[PDB]
Design a protein around this motif. Structure first.
Motif, PDB file in Angstrom:
ATOM      1  N   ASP A 111     -16.386 107.016   0.437  1.00 46.62           N
ATOM      2  CA  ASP A 111     -15.208 106.933   0.735  1.00 46.62           C
ATOM      3  C   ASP A 111     -14.138 105.584   1.982  1.00 46.62           C
ATOM      4  OD1 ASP A 111     -17.573 107.809   3.201  1.00 46.62           O
ATOM      5  OD2 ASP A 111     -15.890 108.583   4.478  1.00 46.62           O
ATOM      6  N   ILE A 112     -15.734 104.669   2.063  1.00 42.29           N
ATOM      7  CA  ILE A 112     -15.346 103.587   2.717  1.00 42.29           C
ATOM      8  C   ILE A 112     -14.751 102.919   0.577  1.00 42.29           C
ATOM      9  CG2 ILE A 112     -16.390 100.738   3.118  1.00 42.29           C
ATOM     10  CD1 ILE A 112     -17.088 102.435   5.037  1.00 42.29           C
TER      11      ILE A 112
ATOM     12  N   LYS B 127     -22.022  95.282   0.816  1.00 38.11           N
ATOM     13  CA  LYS B 127     -21.817  95.755  -0.433  1.00 38.11           C
ATOM     14  C   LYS B 127     -21.862  96.599  -1.286  1.00 38.11           C
ATOM     15  CE  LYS B 127     -23.728  91.790  -1.813  1.00 38.11           C
ATOM     16  NZ  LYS B 127     -23.425  90.839  -0.400  1.00 38.11           N
ATOM     17  N   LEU B 128     -20.848  97.929  -0.055  1.00 38.25           N
ATOM     18  CA  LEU B 128     -19.473  99.106  -0.540  1.00 38.25           C
ATOM     19  C   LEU B 128     -18.246  97.819  -0.023  1.00 38.25           C
ATOM     20  CD1 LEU B 128     -21.091 102.257   1.126  1.00 38.25           C
ATOM     21  CD2 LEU B 128     -20.842 101.630  -1.236  1.00 38.25           C
ATOM     22  N   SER B 129     -18.441  96.809  -0.384  1.00 40.89           N
ATOM     23  CA  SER B 129     -16.747  96.629   0.178  1.00 40.89           C
ATOM     24  C   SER B 129     -17.141  95.501  -0.638  1.00 40.89           C
ATOM     25  CB  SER B 129     -16.410  95.837   1.467  1.00 40.89           C
ATOM     26  OG  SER B 129     -17.496  95.341   1.931  1.00 40.89           O
TER      27      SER B 129
ATOM     28  N   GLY C 245     -22.000  94.855  -6.208  1.00 43.23           N
ATOM     29  CA  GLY C 245     -21.053  95.857  -4.540  1.00 43.23           C
ATOM     30  C   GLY C 245     -21.457  96.376  -5.867  1.00 43.23           C
ATOM     31  N   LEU C 246     -20.111  98.078  -5.061  1.00 44.46           N
ATOM     32  CA  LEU C 246     -20.189  99.163  -5.385  1.00 44.46           C
ATOM     33  C   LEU C 246     -18.812  99.897  -5.084  1.00 44.46           C
ATOM     34  CD1 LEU C 246     -23.103 101.552  -3.724  1.00 44.46           C
ATOM     35  CD2 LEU C 246     -22.971 100.610  -5.739  1.00 44.46           C
ATOM     36  N   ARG C 247     -17.752  98.923  -5.899  1.00 46.37           N
ATOM     37  CA  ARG C 247     -16.737  98.729  -5.472  1.00 46.37           C
ATOM     38  C   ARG C 247     -16.233  98.333  -6.575  1.00 46.37           C
ATOM     39  NH1 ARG C 247     -12.985  96.590  -0.991  1.00 46.37           N
ATOM     40  NH2 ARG C 247     -10.693  97.490  -1.598  1.00 46.37           N
TER      41      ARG C 247
ATOM     42  N   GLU D  13     -11.610 109.752  -7.911  1.00 54.21           N
ATOM     43  CA  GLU D  13     -11.926 108.304  -7.305  1.00 54.21           C
ATOM     44  C   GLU D  13     -11.614 107.347  -6.737  1.00 54.21           C
ATOM     45  OE1 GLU D  13     -14.733 107.393 -10.785  1.00 54.21           O
ATOM     46  OE2 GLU D  13     -16.258 106.495  -8.703  1.00 54.21           O
ATOM     47  N   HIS D  14     -10.309 107.311  -6.880  1.00 55.33           N
ATOM     48  CA  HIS D  14      -9.546 106.612  -6.507  1.00 55.33           C
ATOM     49  C   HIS D  14      -8.175 106.414  -6.370  1.00 55.33           C
ATOM     50  CE1 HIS D  14     -12.995 103.353  -7.649  1.00 55.33           C
ATOM     51  NE2 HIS D  14     -13.452 103.746  -8.716  1.00 55.33           N
ATOM     52  N   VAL D  15      -8.047 107.143  -6.117  1.00 51.69           N
ATOM     53  CA  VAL D  15      -6.850 107.663  -5.610  1.00 51.69           C
ATOM     54  C   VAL D  15      -6.865 108.648  -3.915  1.00 51.69           C
ATOM     55  CG1 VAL D  15      -4.951 109.446  -5.738  1.00 51.69           C
ATOM     56  CG2 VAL D  15      -6.041 107.287  -7.402  1.00 51.69           C
ATOM     57  N   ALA D  16      -5.839 108.142  -3.036  1.00 51.45           N
ATOM     58  CA  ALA D  16      -6.093 108.752  -2.049  1.00 51.45           C
ATOM     59  C   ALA D  16      -5.273 110.000  -1.847  1.00 51.45           C
ATOM     60  CB  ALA D  16      -5.216 108.475  -0.963  1.00 51.45           C
ATOM     61  N   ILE D  17      -6.389 111.294  -2.468  1.00 47.29           N
ATOM     62  CA  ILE D  17      -5.662 112.656  -2.665  1.00 47.29           C
ATOM     63  C   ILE D  17      -5.620 113.856  -1.404  1.00 47.29           C
ATOM     64  CG2 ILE D  17      -7.217 112.608  -4.582  1.00 47.29           C
ATOM     65  CD1 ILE D  17      -4.922 114.637  -5.524  1.00 47.29           C
ATOM     66  N   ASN D  18      -5.082 114.029  -1.433  1.00 50.59           N
ATOM     67  CA  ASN D  18      -5.900 115.520  -0.037  1.00 50.59           C
ATOM     68  C   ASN D  18      -5.789 116.672  -1.098  1.00 50.59           C
ATOM     69  OD1 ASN D  18      -4.724 113.833   2.198  1.00 50.59           O
ATOM     70  ND2 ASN D  18      -2.511 115.443   2.462  1.00 50.59           N
ATOM     71  N   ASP D  19      -6.987 116.923  -0.696  1.00 48.95           N
ATOM     72  CA  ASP D  19      -7.660 118.859  -1.218  1.00 48.95           C
ATOM     73  C   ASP D  19      -6.522 119.618  -1.706  1.00 48.95           C
ATOM     74  OD1 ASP D  19     -10.030 117.248  -0.742  1.00 48.95           O
ATOM     75  OD2 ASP D  19     -10.698 119.226   0.116  1.00 48.95           O
TER      76      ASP D  19
END
Ligand SMILES: O=C([O-])CC(=O)C(=O)O
Ligand SMILES: O=C([O-])CC(=O)C(=O)O
Ligand SMILES: O=C([O-])CC(=O)C(=O)O
Ligand SMILES: O=C([O-])CC(=O)C(=O)O
Ligand SMILES: O=C([O-])CC(=O)C(=O)O
Ligand SMILES: O=C([O-])CC(=O)C(=O)O
Lengths: 225, 225, 225, 225, 225, 225
Positions: free
Chosen positions: E70-71, E98-100, E106-108, F41-47
């Motif tokens: 969630d980072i 490396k999350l950033s 990295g992992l992004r 995964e790459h979307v800010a989305i509420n449950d």
């Protein structure tokens, strides 16, 4: 479609929805209800939430009917019907009718049921007037609210209130318009059906849920000893 | 407070909440329930909505209990209790206990009920172990989910499943811990109460609402002719 | 500012927004659009969501214009312009103008573009009247909706509809007011620009997205064999 | 109840709420305020959010008052009072009064404070008229907005503006109606209290928060060297 | 950019945000704050609301910093910095770094400040270790939470707690890393600045708002007589 | 059902959804897409928003597939399939499989497609291992992300990256598992179809919308002179 049921001789059963939650909608659909009346008049409900409920009703295969007071927006959301409360004059009905139609010959851009509910004695007096509008499909009886408007508690269902209701059906049925009853007892259903009535709203979810839960819990404590 | 009721010899009655709507919370409170278990495990519910429900429970004067799986956040929202599902080992319980306490001697910053639910046979085997943690107040029986975990439908309540449940009470009650039962019938209540049990969860709202509505509607059509 | 562009001889290009999502706003801004017309007339959109979109437009450096039907609230949200639909009389315009100004000499408390859209033939007849209000900056042509109001599909763009539009520009341009065109083809742009028109709305996002996607997918299946 | 405080000789202190967040409500309650005026007139706030705030106020034991411009909906949400802005004629007040009462002798179905705010000079002229409606409990002075409506900045508080305010109190107090003052200084409080005034609104949260924060930060940089 | 300020010899002032409302963000920006630390650790905040706040911060021209736990998602939302709480080992920091960053290293997927906050004595012991990670830009002192973790109330700021803090600065400053202080008094600012410290977080909004409001109201009653 | 299409020899076409709006879902469905991959995964989305989208997909008669990273919750929301990103070992797949099944022989209570996406070279090496799990229905190629993980821009599609992809199909197809391709060109579709591939994801909505809009607008200015 709701008309489509009514044109086949089908009886249709609905309920008022006082809880703006999609799960409640899906619960109602699973209970066997043919339609649900999403009550937006006495429910704090966001416009996007109303759209959510209409989508939920469609995915649960239950007919979405919205009781309003923005008619365009609701119809644009996918509502298959509009119940308008406290209709007194005919001016109101004709305006609603052309609010639900296309330009040029309407005020809406690009088989929805146009429904009027009678809840004031003024609506009862203009019933011969009201129930002849080209575009009006259904007239919903609201005996309780009508009683409360006459300074008479609905708890004592007087003859005069019942008389105003039966006068509504007779007039409405005379012009080939659909009648919708709100039976307080389940045997008032058979009485209306024998007269040709096909549409029935059986209370509201919040009301029935409180009654069942509080009583069931009471018995639970009672049985406990 | 929930402890406060239990320390007075009071029986307390609660229900699972599967519908994340504040009106449903207020309906439950009005039905007479002492507490409501806001189920966040099988409900798509936003964090702000959960906070809304806890506020709604407090304003309706009904005790907010949250069934989790973020323990800090829920407790920071004002939940008076935490029910943790599928507890198998004691490691879990002790960690939850210190997740609900202050620094230095906890992992939370600035009488909440710490509750563990037994739903796997592993939890039944470690029950003597589990039910002695300093900080654990209540242990909730989950016979149905336990049955389903043993490849046995809860519909046939076998002796072995019932044996695992009664073994849980005896162990839990031996260490002065609170027991909470999930009676399938209302006469299983009187049986638990005679053993000293004070806490009872009576099904879930969504489940009871479907059962009442679908049946009531069925009778409505049945009576109609 | 939008005026600021128009006073520099700049052409400005905008689009209607039918999807109340901040990502869609940011997508439009990245596409190169100078402004976006957030359509609140035919979109189920919460008031807080509208505020979200206006913030999103500002952070994406695209000019937020809102098409309304609460004028104060939208302007309080940070909208740089207001497009009012179906303007027929001048009474409407003057009221909108002073709805967007300060007390004492307005109905709003503590360079916003006041825009009127002509979509009914009544608005075309009162155009000399309408396009002289002190406070009215821009008049938007709406030939399609105007066509549909005359019982004529916009699919056949008749001479009369086009005549009503060119009469609007001539009148509007005569009083030094800004004209905004809705070209159906990209070569109608060059024609308007030669007349001095600087402001152009190129369809709506939802409309263009459906057209591109459905066609692209069709070719994808077509190419597949 | 707010009346209940006023009938006991209690002074009550409130504040305007410009930030539609439940935490802000709980912060206000913790600050010692007797009530909070949730301002829905100049706040982009969803209907469900307003309901959230009213629940939050109740759970924080602070009286929820809503300043409106849907009166039924707010009162159905649990608001203990309604402040209506820019009241000019008496027609408005009597309509609001019966919007807050039961059928038959109202337009609302099944001790709320009916409050009118005077912010235009027209309201000052009809004050003897306005302040005698059966149903009107409180009249709120709005000297600043009144000043701004007279083309006079409130920054210079002229004698005429102050005269219109003191004339309001005298008239309102003559009919046994409650007066609510908006003191700019904390010593204007003692002056009103000596006249019998019990109700006081001390600015708005957003306004006081900006003033404290910006100044405190300024001193922080100032002290830093 | 925040680095960009720090590379120019600029002092930067920020505040913790405990109220997930866009208006609060805009209020903070207007107060003169260079950045705001949106605290998601002790705030019930939806993911879409967090995105709303980041957009609001950008449109208000204030630097958005998010304190996580969630980072990727937060950084994908447009946060210019990440404050990670309760950092104890170096393993944590290198993973965050490396999350950033981008794949491959990295992992992004497709100048963000990587910030670690020291709040446990374990973090103080591994400070020489922690403050040398390639990728770590800033280390935030958290003396209060550190005190509370040592069984010592922060109310009595003991020498040992202060010693652990000054040891953090010396180590951090030795590796050319940025230090951020949380001064309890405004004169602790001048002391840190003389040591070269440029970054300062001045409390939290909710905390300062409660303190100002409750006191101001108290004086209001005090002055009233 | 998606399996049901694949068992009939049908080709199915889908798209990634980066915009969490129900209207976007309905737009995709109207474009002719057989399914839509709601990318969480790459979307800010509420449950609750995700649940809204799944309902919207069902009411629009388009198959809802969710790309995750809470598997239970999504499947409880009504998702007909789960795409799991960055699958490297087989341990992951078997765990996902039994996360999607019933107790006793799963971790979920009361024809969903279990899909794994290969995006790291580690996943390519364990492909013979991965693509034999009982419960795994489909394996999605992710050549671009795989390229980026190898320090190679996908812009230059090297032979090695393409080799890893064709090795995936051959292995996957050898165990009778479904293959899903992500063609960059529309003629890569015909090539995969000749090999027996039936499932195709054609980019993402946000990506295609930006490309169409920015280009169309560019031509609009270009044509304008
Ligand atoms: O009002 C508009 O801008 C156009 C429209 O869709 C209508 O309401 O007929
Ligand atoms: O984590 C922090 O930044 C401080 C805090 O309130 C805690 O979690 O003890
Ligand atoms: O209406 C009010 O209460 C004051 C105000 O801001 C206005 O609308 O002029
Ligand atoms: O309007 C209705 O349908 C009934 C009602 O509750 C009212 O407003 O009196
Ligand atoms: O995970 C995926 O499906 C692709 C992606 O954007 C990433 O996380 O690198
Ligand atoms: O976890 C519970 O409380 C019961 C349940 O539905 C499950 O997850 O099997």
């Amino acid at each position: 479609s709701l008309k489509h049921r009514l044109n086949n001789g089908d009886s249709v059963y609905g309920i008022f929805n006082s809880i703006p939650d999609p799960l409640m909608i899906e619960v109602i659909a699973a209970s066997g209800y043919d339609f649900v009346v999403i009550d937006t008049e006495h429910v704090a409900i966001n416009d996007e939430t109303l759209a959510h409920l209409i989508r939920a009703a469609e995915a649960a295969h239950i007919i979405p009917i919205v009781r309003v007071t923005d008619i365009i927006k609701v119809l644009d959301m996918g509502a298959r019907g509009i119940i308008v409360p406290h209709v007194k004059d005919r001016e109101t009905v004709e305006h609603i009718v052309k609010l639900s139609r296309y330009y040029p010959q309407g005020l809406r851009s690009l088989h929805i049921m146009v429904i009027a509910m009678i809840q004031d004695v003024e609506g009862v007096m203009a019933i011969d007037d009201i129930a002849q509008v080209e575009g009006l499909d259904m007239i919903v009886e609201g005996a309780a609210d009508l009683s409360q408007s006459l300074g008479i508690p609905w708890q004592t269902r007087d003859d005069q209130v019942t008389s105003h209701v039966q006068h509504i059906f007779e007039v409405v049925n005379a012009h080939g318009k659909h009648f919708c009853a709100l039976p307080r007892e389940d045997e008032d259903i058979a009485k209306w059906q024998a007269q040709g009535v096909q549409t029935f709203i059986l209370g509201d979810d919040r009301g029935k849920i409180y009654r069942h839960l509080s009583a069931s819990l009471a018995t639970s404590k009672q049985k406990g000893d």
